[PDB]
Amino acid sequence: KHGRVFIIKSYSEDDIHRSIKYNIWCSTEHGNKRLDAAYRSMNGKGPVYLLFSVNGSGHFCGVAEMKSAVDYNTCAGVWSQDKWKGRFDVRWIFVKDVPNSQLRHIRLENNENKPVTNSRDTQEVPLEKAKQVLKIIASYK
Ligand SMILES: [Cl-]
């Protein structure tokens, strides 16, 4: 495809549940700006996919598509913590726990060849490594 794919790291499993319930997410300022630029410059040509993992959990927990630009002025305090400013919409595609052992072989040439499972929040994944990750997530039993 023409997709672009980002890792999402959360310190809050509660915020993930809320995001699956209401189809919204929010990253840092720096993270919002990264995802905003990628979504807008995409013009609707392809999908922005988001690969979610909770920090320390040892597993990825699903896949969602970014479904709107970033709105930086929205209701405060909707998450577990107050630090988040803004909102954007998502559509969750897969909601399943996939152990990091299933993905650790995939390394990112744009991240000093580190395993994809050792990425920080909003790390971008090269397209062919991303299609690798998505195949494993979709097919995992
Ligand atoms: Cl690429």
Swiss-Prot record:
One of its GO terms (cellular component) is cytoplasm. GO terms for molecular function: C5-methylcytidine-containing RNA reader activity; mRNA binding; N6-methyladenosine-containing RNA reader activity; RNA binding. It comes from Homo sapiens. Specifically recognizes and binds N6-methyladenosine (m6A)-containing RNAs, and regulates their stability. M6A is a modification present at internal sites of mRNAs and some non-coding RNAs and plays a role in mRNA stability and processing. Acts as a regulator of mRNA stability by promoting degradation of m6A-containing mRNAs via interaction with the CCR4-NOT and ribonuclease P/MRP complexes, depending on the context. The YTHDF paralogs (YTHDF1, YTHDF2 and YTHDF3) share m6A-containing mRNAs targets and act redundantly to mediate mRNA degradation and cellular differentiation. (Microbial infection) Promotes viral gene expression and replication of polyomavirus SV40: acts by binding to N6-methyladenosine (m6A)-containing viral RNAs. Residues 1-141 are annotated as: Interaction with m6A-containing mRNAs. Disulfide bonds: none annotated. The gene is YTHDF2. The disordered regions have the ability to interact with each other and to 'phase separate' into liquid droplets within the cytosol following binding to mRNAs containing multiple m6A-modified residues. This leads to the partition of m6A-containing mRNAs into membraneless compartments, where mRNAs may be stored, degraded or used to transport mRNAs to dendritic arbors in neurons. Keywords: Acetylation, Cell cycle, Cell division, Cytoplasm, Differentiation, Host-virus interaction, Immunity, Innate immunity, Mitosis, Nucleus, Oogenesis, Phosphoprotein, RNA-binding, Spermatogenesis, Ubl conjugation. This is YTH domain-containing family protein 2. Changing R120A: Decreased binding to RNAs. Changing R34A: Slightly decreased binding to RNAs. Induction: Following heat shock stress.
